C-alpha cells in the first residue's frame, strides 16, 4: 500500500550511512592535504603524511569510548548485541578513517628503502641498513599511531568525567560544516573551466571526487566481508591489501615509467594529475590505520600481533611483487 515500514526504515538507515560516509571522507581529505602541505620538513626525518595518521588516531580516541559494539564484537561475548558494527559511521569510518594513509605509509617505507638489495641480497651491509631503516620507519609510524590512540582514550576519559557539555552541541557544528562543504562543493566545482583549469584549484578536485568512492568501498568491505572468520576481521585487511597493490601499480605507472615514454605521455597536465588525485583519494580512502588501530591493541587481546604481522608482511611482499 503506502510503504513497508520494516523496509523503508532499513533504506533510510542505509542512505544515512551512505551520506555520512561520503561527507566524512570529503571533509577528511581536505584535512589530509592541509597536513601534507603543512609538512614544513624542518626536522621530522620522515615527515609528509606522518602526522596525518597520528591525528586520525587521536580524534578516533574520542570515539572508541562510546563505540562499544565494535569493541564488543572484538570480544566474542554478549549474545543479545546484534548492534551496528561501525557506530558513529560519519566519524569512525569517515573522518578518522579516510585521513589515514596505510597504503601511503607502506609506499613511503618502500621508497625510503630504495631497493635495499642494490646488487646482491646476501651482502650484510646493504641488507642490514635497508632492513634497519624499514623497521625503523614502520615502528615509528605504528608506535606513534598507537600512542596517539592511547592519549585519545586518556583525554576522552579526562574530558568525560568532568562534564559532557551536551553532545548535540557538537552535532550542530558537524551539521553546519556539512552545509559549508556542500555549498563549496557546489559553487567552486561548478564554476570552473570545462578542462578544469590548472593550479591549486584542480589539484584537489579529482582527488575529492574519487575519495568518497574509495571510502564507500572500504565501508562495504568492512561491513559485508568482515566477521566472516573469527578473530580475523579480514575486511580491513583485504581493503588495505587492495589499496596497497593498487597504489603500487599506479605508482609504477606514474613514477616507474617502465616503457620510459609514459612520463612523456603524462607531460600533459591531465594524465598525471588524474593518477595523483587517485593516489590522494581512492587508495587513501580505502586503507585506514584508524580502523587498523582499533583492530590493534585497543582490543583483540594477544592475537592482535598475528594480525598486524600478517597484514604488514603480505602488503610488503605484494609491493615487492610489483617491483618484479
Amino acid at each position: 500500500g503506502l510503504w513497508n515500514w520494516f523496509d523503508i526504515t532499513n533504506w533510510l538507515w542505509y542512505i544515512k550511512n551512505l551520506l555520512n560516509i561520503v561527507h566524512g571522507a570529503i571533509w577528511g581529505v581536505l584535512v589530509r592535504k592541509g597536513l601534507m602541505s603543512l609538512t614544513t620538513y624542518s626536522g621530522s626525518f620522515l615527515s609528509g603524511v606522518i602526522w596525518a595518521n597520528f591525528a586520525a588516531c587521536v580524534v578516533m580516541g574520542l570515539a572508541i569510548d562510546g563505540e562499544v559494539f565494535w569493541i564488543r564484537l572484538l570480544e566474542e561475548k554478549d549474545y543479545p548485541n546484534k548492534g551496528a558494527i561501525p557506530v558513529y559511521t560519519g566519524l569512525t569510518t569517515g573522518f578518522c578513517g579516510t585521513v589515514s594513509s596505510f597504503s601511503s605509509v607502506i609506499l613511503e617505507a618502500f621508497n625510503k628503502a630504495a631497493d635495499t638489495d642494490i646488487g646482491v641480497r646476501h651482502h650484510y651491509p646493504n641488507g642490514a641498513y635497508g632492513i634497519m631503516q624499514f623497521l625503523a620507519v614502520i615502528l615509528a609510524q605504528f608506535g606513534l599511531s598507537i600512542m596517539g590512540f592511547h592519549m585519545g582514550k586518556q583525554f576522552s576519559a579526562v574530558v568525560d568525567n568532568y562534564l559532557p557539555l551536551v553532545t548535540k552541541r557538537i552535532y550542530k557544528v558537524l551539521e553546519l560544516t556539512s552545509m559549508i562543504l556542500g555549498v563549496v562543493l557546489v559553487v567552486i566545482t561548478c564554476i570552473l573551466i570545462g578542462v578544469k583549469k590548472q593550479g591549486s584549484w584542480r589539484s584537489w578536485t579529482f582527488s575529492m571526487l574519487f575519495a568518497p568512492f574509495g571510502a564507500l568501498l572500504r565501508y562495504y568491505l568492512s561491513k559485508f566481508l568482515n566477521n566472516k572468520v573469527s578473530n580475523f576481521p579480514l575486511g580491513t585487511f583485504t581493503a588495505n591489501f587492495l589499496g596497497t597493490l593498487l597504489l603500487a601499480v599506479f605508482t609504477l605507472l606514474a613514477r616507474g615509467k617502465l616503457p620510459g615514454g609514459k612520463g612523456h605521455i603524462v607531460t600533459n597536465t591531465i594524465a598525471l594529475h588524474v593518477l595523483e588525485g587517485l593516489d590522494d583519494g581512492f587508495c587513501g580512502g580505502l586503507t585506514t590505520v584508524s580502523t587498523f588501530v582499533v583492530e590493534l591493541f585497543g582490543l583483540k587481546t594477544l592475537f592482535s600481533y598475528r594480525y598486524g604481522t600478517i597484514s604488514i608482511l603480505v602488503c610488503f611482499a605484494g609491493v615487492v611483487l610489483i617491483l618484479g
Epitope: 500500500g1 503506502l2 546484534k82
Partner: antibody, heavy 131, light 109 residues
C-alpha cells in the same frame, strides 16, 4: 476524542480459551497498528504483541513467554481488534489494554526499525485465570 | 529483566527530580515514557529525542545519553504522583518492545 474500549473479560479455567474484543473509532484504523499490553495486578505491565497493517500484510509479533500461546488478528471491516487465548497459564491474569501504536524513526540518529510510542490507550479489561 | 529502574523515588513539592531507565538496548534505540495512575489508562508522556504530544504540561523533559534514558520531572505537583514506565526495543534492533520493572513516584504530602 479517540477511544478504545476492551471487552470479553471474566474468569477462565487454566488451559481454556477466551476471546477479547476492542471497539475503536474516530481515527484511521486500516493504516494504524494495534498493540496488546497486559498488566498483572500490583506489578509492572508487560508487552503481549502488536499487529501491523497494509505496510507488511498484517504481520504479527509476540512476547517470548507468549509466542505460540496467543493469537492476534484484526478485522478491518468491523473496526475492531480481536485477541485469542488458548492454553492459558496462571501468569496471564491481569488487566489487558489495547493501545494504538505510533511509529517513530529519526532520519539521522537511530537504528532500524526505530522505536514505538502509543499515542493513546484504552480503559482496560480484567481477566482472572484462577484454578 | 531487559530493562531496569529504581523501584521508588521520593521528592518534595516544586522540586525537580529524575527517573532513570537503564538498559543495554537504549544505546541504539530511543525511549518512551508513560504516566500510570492506579485504575486509570496510561497516558503517553515523552518519546523519541524531543517529541512530546500536545496537551501535556512542559514540566516533563526527557534526555537520552549512553546506556541510560532519563525523564526528569520539574516541579512535581499534587497530581503528579503515579508510576512511570520506560519502553523501547528489547534487543538492539528487534521487532519487539518491553517495559521496565516499575518506578513508583511519591509527592511528599
Amino acid at each position: 476524542e479517540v477511544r478504545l474500549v476492551e471487552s470479553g473479560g471474566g474468569l477462565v479455567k487454566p488451559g481454556g480459551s477466551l476471546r477479547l474484543s476492542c471497539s475503536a473509532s474516530g481515527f484511521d484504523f486500516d493504516n494504524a497498528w494495534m498493540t496488546w499490553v497486559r498488566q498483572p495486578p500490583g506489578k509492572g505491565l508487560e508487552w503481549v504483541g502488536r499487529i501491523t497493517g497494509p505496510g507488511e500484510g498484517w504481520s504479527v509479533d509476540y512476547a517470548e513467554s507468549v509466542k505460540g500461546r496467543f493469537t492476534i488478528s484484526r478485522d478491518n471491516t468491523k473496526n475492531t481488534l480481536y485477541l485469542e487465548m488458548n492454553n492459558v497459564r496462571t501468569e496471564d491474569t491481569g488487566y489487558y489494554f489495547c493501545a494504538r501504536t505510533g511509529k517513530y524513526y529519526d532520519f539521522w540518529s537511530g537504528y532500524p526499525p526505530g522505536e514505538e510510542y502509543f499515542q493513546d490507550w484504552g480503559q482496560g479489561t480484567l481477566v482472572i485465570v484462577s484454578s | 529483566s531487559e530493562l531496569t529502574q529504581d523501584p521508588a523515588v521520593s521528592v518534595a513539592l516544586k522540586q525537580t527530580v529524575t527517573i532513570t531507565c537503564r538498559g543495554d538496548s537504549l544505546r541504539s534505540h530511543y525511549a518512551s515514557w508513560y504516566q500510570k495512575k492506579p485504575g486509570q489508562a496510561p497516558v503517553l508522556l515523552f518519546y523519541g529525542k524531543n517529541n512530546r504530544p500536545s496537551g501535556i504540561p512542559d514540566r516533563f523533559s526527557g534526555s537520552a545519553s549512553g546506556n541510560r534514558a532519563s525523564l526528569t520531572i520539574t516541579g512535581a505537583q499534587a497530581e503528579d504522583e503515579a508510576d512511570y514506565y520506560c519502553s523501547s526495543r528489547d534487543k538492539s534492533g528487534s521487532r519487539l518492545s518491553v517495559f521496565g520493572g516499575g518506578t513508583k513516584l511519591t509527592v511528599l504530602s
